[PDB]
Design a protein around this ligand. Structure first.
Ligand SMILES: Nc1ncnc2c1ncn2[C@@H]1O[C@H](COP(=O)(O)OP(=O)(O)O)[C@@H](O)[C@H]1O
Ligand SMILES: [Mg+2]
Lengths: 747, 139, 371, 7
């Protein structure tokens, strides 16, 4: 131990998640006396320790790896001071850039700073987005591997602006003349409208992950961009929990149903359709979808989508909306039928132009065939409902991929692409009071993306130690692969969830039962909540998360009867519809399996590349600018995964100092009249005298490494020596002057 | 201590008696001890004083007979040089740095006291020969 | 890594990749052999033909079914059937894919072990399983509680399954099949003065049985009715062009499933054996078996068999305990489909008998690991 | 079979 009146410690508090205390009596081995700096004194109890605070010179430093003690409170303080008083919004946490949004503009983005950042290493300058951007740009210039930037957080945090400026950097440093930036920023409203939705905790959340590749010629002029998408939340189309919404574009239609252009779509209000009504929350307050539709049309015009296509899109979406209303009456356990003249089917068949009797037949029977003969077999009402909802999800997913294909059409450019830099916009970790297959997928994707980040930082440190000739072994590679193996692999949760989708009868109860039977005793990371047999808990990279089974078997299942595709494929009333289906197992594959494969394609895209990382954080819910709540900020910092990045760093050698600056700062402690005649061997002698155990420090060619907290220990012994000598001087001069004043008394 | 020392010390003590009761204040006790050749810290002075409370430190008066055990207790160069060499290596010390440390760390003195003792010992560059200043202040 | 499923009938082989909708290869389980001297030197003769290859030439050949009543016989011909199934018709080597096989409930215990021995030793199959057909019929039907009447060529059996338990003591095996219905249709057709002696026209009689036969909702009035009026007579064109005409006979043949006595069989008919199989269950479940009652396999395909079944077993049911008969039209394939879905289950992947395990335990491994 | 019947 070392604990003394001079030190400080962090006490917990429910309202500022830590508070600072003056330690008022030196500890010795059960209670501590702690004065408090809002003017209070307390006594505090040590259980069968409070985290010690860094010395004040260290705090506020530009890179959190400088900090000798690494803690949630220390980190949160170092971010809070930089945001609130220095008004610096960017920090380095390792390789990671943490970014915190002002909810404002700032000067910082001006061109002269763009020039200033040119020609320097990322550590040679204070952190800013351009310092990442140029580290990518120069790596692309110097070395053949082209580069990626990755941006994470809740959708509010500002990932958009963080991309906007990365693009603005690339164009300006390239010296290129040009639309592409204005085009990319003009694409965002359609990508939101199709691909973004109201979640319980957030009014807009990006529910897919968006990759924009900026490409270059061999003189690194920007030649163009292209757009890719992954991980789309197909299940949201047909299903929502309470007070959610599905994708905004449906509500933008419903807010426009009275305009004469859409009269043929016969839309109701947002409570009329089974997909919209189910959420129980038609309107986002303060956000008007009705006007935003006009901005979406604007974006379509700026991307050259003809008005004929735009009307086709809105009529296909009205298609899906009407389709969701068609209703089935049971005739027997294994038969249902649509009633005669059924009204929403009649409207759907108008909108698609399809022959009413063929949709009416195929929605109520499945085809079964063999090379010799074929059968038409009726199906249950349940299966007809699942078929309808699968057809909706397949139509939507192909519409999305087609709109993205026109965005690429607009953004592509003919020149042969030498190389590219990829800006990835993706959702961070998600957690709620009721959380469902949507969260289970989001959190699996985050587990893989975090594994990739671990792979990369572990590599970069085994590079750095080999430059400094340190043995390999000391860096502990932390490894979250056992959780991925729990989720992904053949016994794992997603597989058994697809397996019960087919097993002759399958249910949320029987699925949970098969989970518990397989995992519960067997596994480190899987746990059961005491009260319930209908929930499970994953010990998960950020947190424990409880998931509840009742949603999953409905949400999991997509299967599309080829005959319904082969009917819609036939229509000629308008030519978009057969375009959607231009080029199987895919019709059988469940949503979770499609998601697994999409995530593989994403990870193989990123693993072909050298990443750079960003994190965007939201200080507060209220959008009060330059205000910062420890309670909210900690939750963001956990979701961003900065806190486990730091807990992984604390295991290693956080602190790295040159022999020259060490010799400078501790010349005070060094017994200069005694000290040896050269910097490296003398400072090695000094530190060997000051600290016994070579385990605690390591000698590079140029830099000395220390484990966590020992820089504080040094700063304390420095303060002790300095002040003790100071006292000696003070009393000597005081005694001198009092002698003189006595001599005045004698006078 | 012999009778002669006690007589000289009592006479000096009486020069510090500003009330005529044959006593000094506790806050003067340190002054008398240092005038008599001791160099105790203020912490050491309070310890030999018995860690007095503010009220008796500022107004309680003690005669020579009570002071004497305290003087005894207090009574019972190379470190000083190394202490100055902390802030040095051309044998000089900045006046600004010595002023800051003497007025802000340890048992802080006033800026006027430091100016008085430092007057005439620093040159135009603002450097103090600390070996000479130390010999001067120890005489 | 998709498995294979081939349902070894007594009349057809049905095979395909696991997880397909319905099988790719369906061909008759016949080996054909020539019975004549070939005149033309350089004809390009070859010794034996399999399935559609034999059936296309059958007038030149004689045809043996290597399977009687689910019991594999003359096994070198069976080995030829399997070799043709994997190599020619699937075109896929068995050493790459695990394989699933189907069997009647009660049959000579050695037969499984020899079949396994062939599968590992001849083909080096990675892993193998065998499943009771009337289990797979419920996987196919999407039901966990069931009683299943399953009949094709070779065999008929009832199996009750309640919530994924089979009830072995209740399993009734009955040996009527489309083979004995065919031999009866031959003998009785001779009553109208037509003769069919050899294997090559047996398949003509079988094709008649498939198209024309149907089951009477009540037999005993309609027997007199067809003798009283000819509107129930219908006619069919043989190979080699001569037309024949068949009347009351066409119902009289499949009626023998309900009247086994006509063939000279001692047993109860399928309805009464179904009833006795339910009666052997405990009364807690009999209502639930009565309702969820499923037909399986090709012999069931005669028109009206379901309404005849419902009518006749109603007469044994206590009228409160209502009943229903689930005859899906696929059901000729259902035993295959249930194996296709079964082999795709993740949980099943544990169940495979691997080559490593057979190396440990020898052919006796089947009964030890398997059902 | 092996006894009671021809197979
Ligand atoms: N449409 C049909 N009508 C009447 N009988 C049929 C029909 N299709 C097939 N069969 C008869 O079904 C029998 C084969 O049944 P199947 O279930 O395939 O046996 P296995 O599966 O054991 O080979 C044959 O005797 C065939 O004549
Ligand atoms: Mg069969």
């Amino acid at each position: 131990e070392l604990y003394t009146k001079y030190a400080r410690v962090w006490i917990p508090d429910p309202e500022e998640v830590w508070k600072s205390a003056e330690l008022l009596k030196d500890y010795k081995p059960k209670v501590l006396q702690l004065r408090l700096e809002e003017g209070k004194d307390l006594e505090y109890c040590l259980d069968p320790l409070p985290p010690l605070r860094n010395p004040d010179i260290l705090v506020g430093e530009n890179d959190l790896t400088a900090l000798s003690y690494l803690h949630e409170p220390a980190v949160l303080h170092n971010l809070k001071v930089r945001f609130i008083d220095s008004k610096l919004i960017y920090t380095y946490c390792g390789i990671v850039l943490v970014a915190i949004n002002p909810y404002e503009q700032l000067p910082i983005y001006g061109e002269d700073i763009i020039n200033a950042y040119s020609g320097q290493n990322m550590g040679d300058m204070d952190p800013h987005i351009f310092a990442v951007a140029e580290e990518a740009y120069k790596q692309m210039a110097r070395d053949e591997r082209n580069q990626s930037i990755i941006v994470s957080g809740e959708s509010g945090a500002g990932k958009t602006v963080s991309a906007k400026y990365a693009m603005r950097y690339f164009a300006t440093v390239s010296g290129s003349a040009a639309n592409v930036e204005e085009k990319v920023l003009a694409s965002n409203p359609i990508m939101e409208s199709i691909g973004n939705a109201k979640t319980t905790r957030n009014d807009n959340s990006s529910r897919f992950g968006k990759y924009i590749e900026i490409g270059f010629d061999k003189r690194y002029r920007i030649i163009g961009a292209n757009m890719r998408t992954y991980l789309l939340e197909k299940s949201r189309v047909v299903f929502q929990a309470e007070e959610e919404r599905n994708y905004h574009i449906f509500y933008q239609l419903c807010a426009s149903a009275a305009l004469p252009e859409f009269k043929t779509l016969r839309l109701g209000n947002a409570n009329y359709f089974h997909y919209t009504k189910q959420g129980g929350s038609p309107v986002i307050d303060g956000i008007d979808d009705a006007k935003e539709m006009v901005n979406t049309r604007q974006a379509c015009t700026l991307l050259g989508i003809s008005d004929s296509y735009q009307m086709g899109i809105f009529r296909i979406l009205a298609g899906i909306l009407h389709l969701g209303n068609v209703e089935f009456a049971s005739r027997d356990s294994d038969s249902c039928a649509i009633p005669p003249k059924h009204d929403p089917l009649t409207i759907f068949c108008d909108l698609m132009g399809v022959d009413y009797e063929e949709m009416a037949h195929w929605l109520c029977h499945r085809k079964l065939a063999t090379a010799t003969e074929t059968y038409i077999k009726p199906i249950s009402k349940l299966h007809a409902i699942n078929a309808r909802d699968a057809l909706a999800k397949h139509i939507y997913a192909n519409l999305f991929n087609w709109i993205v294909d026109h965005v690429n059409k607009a953004l592509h450019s003919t020149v042969k692409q030498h190389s590219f830099i990829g800006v990835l916009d993706i959702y961070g970790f998600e957690t709620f009071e009721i959380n469902s297959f949507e969260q289970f997928c989001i959190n699996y994707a985050n587990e893989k993306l975090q594994q990739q980040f671990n792979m990369h930082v572990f590599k970069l440190e085994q590079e750095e130690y080999m430059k400094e000739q340190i043995p390999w072994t000391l860096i502990d590679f932390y490894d979250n692969q056992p959780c991925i193996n729990l989720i992904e692999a053949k016994m794992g949760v997603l597989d058994l969830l697809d397996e019960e989708c087919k097993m002759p009868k399958g249910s949320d109860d029987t699925w949970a039962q098969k989970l518990y039977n397989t995992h519960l005793n067997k596994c480190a990371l899987f746990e059961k909540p005491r009260l319930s047999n209908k929930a499970f808990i994953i010990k998960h990279f950020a947190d424990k998360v409880e998931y509840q089974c009742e949603g999953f078997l409905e949400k999991n299942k997509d299967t599309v009867y080829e005959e319904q595709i082969k009917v819609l494929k036939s229509s000629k009333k308008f030519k978009l519809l057969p375009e959607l289906f231009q080029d199987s197992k895919e019709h059988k594959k469940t949503v979770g399996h499609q998601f697994r494969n999409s995530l593989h394609l994403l990870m193989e895209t990123l693993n072909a590349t050298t990443p750079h990382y960003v994190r965007c954080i939201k200080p507060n819910d209220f959008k009060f600018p330059f205000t910062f709540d420890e309670k909210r900020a900690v939750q963001q910092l956990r979701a961003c995964g900065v806190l486990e990045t730091i807990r992984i760093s604390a295991a290693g050698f956080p602190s790295r100092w040159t022999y020259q600056e060490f010799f400078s700062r501790y010349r005070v402690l060094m017994k200069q009249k005694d000290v040896l005649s050269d910097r490296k061997q003398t400072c090695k002698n000094v530190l060997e005298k000051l600290i016994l155990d070579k385990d605690k420090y390591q000698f590079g060619k140029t830099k000395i490494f220390f484990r966590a907290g020992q820089v504080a220990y040094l700063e304390k012994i420095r303060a002790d020596k300095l002040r003790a000598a100071c006292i000696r001087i003070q009393k000597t001069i005081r005694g001198w002057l009092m002698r003189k004043k006595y001599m005045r008394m004698r006078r | 201590f012999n009778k002669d020392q006690l007589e000289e010390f009592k006479e000096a003590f009486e020069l510090f008696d500003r009330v005529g009761d044959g006593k000094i204040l506790y806050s003067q006790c340190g002054d008398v001890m240092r005038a008599l050749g001791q160099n105790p810290t203020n912490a050491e002075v309070l310890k030999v004083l018995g860690n007095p409370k503010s009220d008796e430190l500022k107004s309680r008066r003690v005669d020579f007979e009570t002071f004497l055990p305290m003087l005894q207790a207090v009574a019972k160069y190379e470190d000083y040089l190394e202490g100055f060499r902390v802030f040095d290596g051309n044998g000089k010390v900045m006046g600004a740095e010595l002023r800051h440390v003497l007025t802000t760390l340890g048992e802080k003195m006033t800026e006027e006291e430091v100016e008085t003792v430092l007057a005439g010992h620093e040159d135009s560059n603002g450097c103090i020969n600390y070996e000479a200043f130390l010999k001067h202040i120890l005489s | 890594t998709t498995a294979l499923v081939c349902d070894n009938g007594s009349g057809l082989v049905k095979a395909g990749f696991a997880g397909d909708d319905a099988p790719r290869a369906v061909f008759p389980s016949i080996v054909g052999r020539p019975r004549h001297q070939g005149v033309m030197v350089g004809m390009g003769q070859k010794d034996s033909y399999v399935g559609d290859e034999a059936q296309s030439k059958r007038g030149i050949l004689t045809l043996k079914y290597p399977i009687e009543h689910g019991i594999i016989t003359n096994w070198d011909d069976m080995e030829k059937i399997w070799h043709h199934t994997f190599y020619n018709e699937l075109r896929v080597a068995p050493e790459e894919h695990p394989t699933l096989l189907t069997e009647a409930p009660l049959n000579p215990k050695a037969n499984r072990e020899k079949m396994t021995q062939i599968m590992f030793e001849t083909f080096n199959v990675p892993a193998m399983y065998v499943a009771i057909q009337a289990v797979l019929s419920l996987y196919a039907s999407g039901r966990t509680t069931g009683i299943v009447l399953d009949s094709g060529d070779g065999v008929t059996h009832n199996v009750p399954i309640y919530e994924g338990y089979a009830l072995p003591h209740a399993i009734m095996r009955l040996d009527l099949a489309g083979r004995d219905l065919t031999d009866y249709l031959m003998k009785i057709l001779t009553e109208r003065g037509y003769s069919f002696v050899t294997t090559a026209e047996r398949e003509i009689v079988r094709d008649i049985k498939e198209k024309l036969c149907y089951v009477a909702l009540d037999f005993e009035n309609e027997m007199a009715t067809a003798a009283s009026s000819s509107s129930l007579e219908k006619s069919y064109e043989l190979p080699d062009g001569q037309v024949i005409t068949i009347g009351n006979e066409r119902f009289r043949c499949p009626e023998t499933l309900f009247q086994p006595s006509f063939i000279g069989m001692e047993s109860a008919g399928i309805h009464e054996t179904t009833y006795n199989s339910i009666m052997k269950c405990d009364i807690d479940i009999r209502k639930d078996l009565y309702a969820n009652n499923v037909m399986s396999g090709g012999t069931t395909m005669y028109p009206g068999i379901a309404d005849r079944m419902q009518k006749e077993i109603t007469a044994l049911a206590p009228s409160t305990m209502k009943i229903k008969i689930i005859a899906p039209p696929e059901r000729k394939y259902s035993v295959w489909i249930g194996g296709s879905i079964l082999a795709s289950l993740s949980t099943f992947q544990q169940m495979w008998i691997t080559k490593q395990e057979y190396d440990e335990a020898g052919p006796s491994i089947v009964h030890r690991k398997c059902f | 079979w092996x006894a009671x019947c021809p197979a």
